[PDB]
């Protein structure tokens, strides 16, 4: 009879880096999706597998809320079957994704004058990530044939890189906060209606 804590997600004072994306599980609560689609402060709102309007009349066993920050040009990668540094090495959606992708411009929050170097992204990785996989290893990336065993040098660089958000960047380089809602239907009693 109590509403789901969607405020703790969309309104979090701090967001996680895309490589270490945050995930909150939502269950046993009455989900009021009405205001979310009505919200004009959202720049991106694309649902896959379900209709945006036709959603309040649905019950799900689990609802996962993932949140992170990426570039504006990289928002198009938060979709099924996309490729890129974020979709391959940071956050990957399955081809049969059932959920919605929500994003809005956060240049007024996550950018500092001297550059906000708190938001990071995994730049190099040997293989693409599996769907809903999370990789937070800081092991030095070996690009060449010869290894390094911990030597930040040629063909051996740190796998993580900073965005360095400044308020004067173009919309493509500005920070965008993303919230991905996954709707899970298991053979268990349903908890989110």
């Amino acid at each position: 009879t109590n509403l789901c804590p969607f405020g703790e997600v969309f309104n979090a004072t701090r967001f996680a880096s895309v490589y270490a994306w945050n995930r909150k599980r939502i269950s046993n609560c009455v989900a009021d999706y009405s205001v979310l689609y009505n919200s004009a402060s959202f720049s991106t709102f694309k649902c896959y597998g379900v209709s945006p309007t036709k959603l309040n009349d649905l019950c799900f066993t689990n609802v996962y809320a993932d949140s992170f920050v990426i570039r504006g040009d990289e928002v198009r990668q938060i979709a099924p079957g996309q490729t890129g540094n974020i979709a391959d090495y940071n956050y990957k959606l399955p081809d049969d994704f059932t959920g919605c992708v929500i994003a809005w411009n956060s240049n007024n929050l996550d950018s500092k004058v001297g550059g906000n170097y708190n938001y990071l992204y995994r730049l190099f990785r040997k293989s693409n990530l599996k769907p809903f996989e999370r990789d937070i290893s800081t092991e030095i990336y070996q690009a060449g044939s010869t290894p390094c065993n911990g030597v930040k040098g040629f063909n051996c660089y740190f796998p993580l890189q900073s965005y360095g958000f400044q308020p004067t960047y173009g919309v493509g380089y500005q920070p965008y906060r993303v919230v991905v809602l996954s709707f899970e239907l298991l053979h268990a009693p349903a908890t989110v209606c």
Epitope: N85, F124, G144, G153, N155, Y157, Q161
Partner: antibody, heavy 123, light 109 residues
Framework: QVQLVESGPEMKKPGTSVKVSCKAS????????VQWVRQARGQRLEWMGW????????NYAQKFQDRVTINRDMSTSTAYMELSSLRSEDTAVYYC????????????????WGQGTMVTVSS | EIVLTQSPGTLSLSPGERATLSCRAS???????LAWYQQKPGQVPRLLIY???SRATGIPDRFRGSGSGTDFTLTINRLESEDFAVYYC?????????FGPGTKVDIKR
């Protein structure tokens, strides 16, 4: 066609700056690294600096720390070298080199070289 | 800075002989990252050997590299006429890279 193409000839008065282009083709620019080497007429190769394309991290020799800044623009897949406070001693041919790489692995050496950029400084 | 030196300054050999060039590093290479380049007059350098002993693509098998720490060797088994040029070595494993002074291989007379 793994290629690396540079700017045209430059002729700058002493004390000004020159920015030499170095555009890549045929390979994934994001993951390799670009070094800059100059060579005076009939002299040896002189290493200036290098930049990692993905991170943008730079390293510069002692002689060129004061006046050289290497950057890159991965949207145009071009790395640049800027040399400020030019003088007659800077008159040389400037080369850029990079390893050929794909999405995940690189060559263990600088096998891709540019055609050269002639910079002439004289009052 | 790692100092790089080559010997000899000029190598006088006849076409057909075996050439042997030397490259010396002031300290141990950071990661066996020693490259050999060939430069004909008025041309761009051409990578011959990368990473100590690994031939680059398109280089004939007569070019070979060796070494490990501070003393490295470039060996041409049978010197062809197209091989008479200047040869530079470069270490590139420790932040700052450095070149050698070069070694000119000319026709013996």
């Amino acid at each position: 066609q793994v290629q690396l193409v540079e700017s045209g000839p430059e002729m700058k008065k002493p004390g000004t700056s020159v920015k030499v282009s170095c555009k890549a083709s045929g390979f994934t620019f994001i993951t390799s690294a670009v070094q800059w080497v100059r060579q005076a007429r009939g002299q040896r190769l002189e290493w200036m600096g290098w930049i990692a394309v993905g991170s943008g991290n730079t390293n510069y020799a002692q002689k060129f720390q004061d006046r050289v800044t290497i950057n890159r623009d991965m949207s145009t897949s071009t790395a640049y070298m800027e040399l400020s406070s030019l003088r007659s001693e800077d008159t040389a041919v400037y080369y850029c080199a990079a390893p050929h790489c794909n999405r995940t692995s690189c060559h263990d050496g600088f096998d891709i070289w540019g055609q050269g950029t002639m910079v002439t400084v004289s009052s | 800075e790692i100092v790089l030196t080559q010997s000899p300054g000029t190598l006088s050999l006849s076409p057909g002989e075996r050439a042997t060039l030397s490259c010396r590093a002031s300290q141990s290479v950071s990661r066996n990252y020693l490259a050999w380049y060939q430069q004909k007059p008025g041309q761009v350098p051409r990578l011959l050997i990368y990473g100590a002993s690994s031939r680059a693509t398109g280089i004939p098998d007569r070019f070979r590299g060796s070494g490990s720490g501070t003393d490295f060797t470039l060996t041409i088994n049978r010197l062809e006429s197209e091989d008479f040029a200047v040869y530079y070595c470069q270490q590139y494993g420790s932040s700052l890279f450095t070149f050698g002074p070069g070694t000119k291989v000319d026709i013996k007379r």
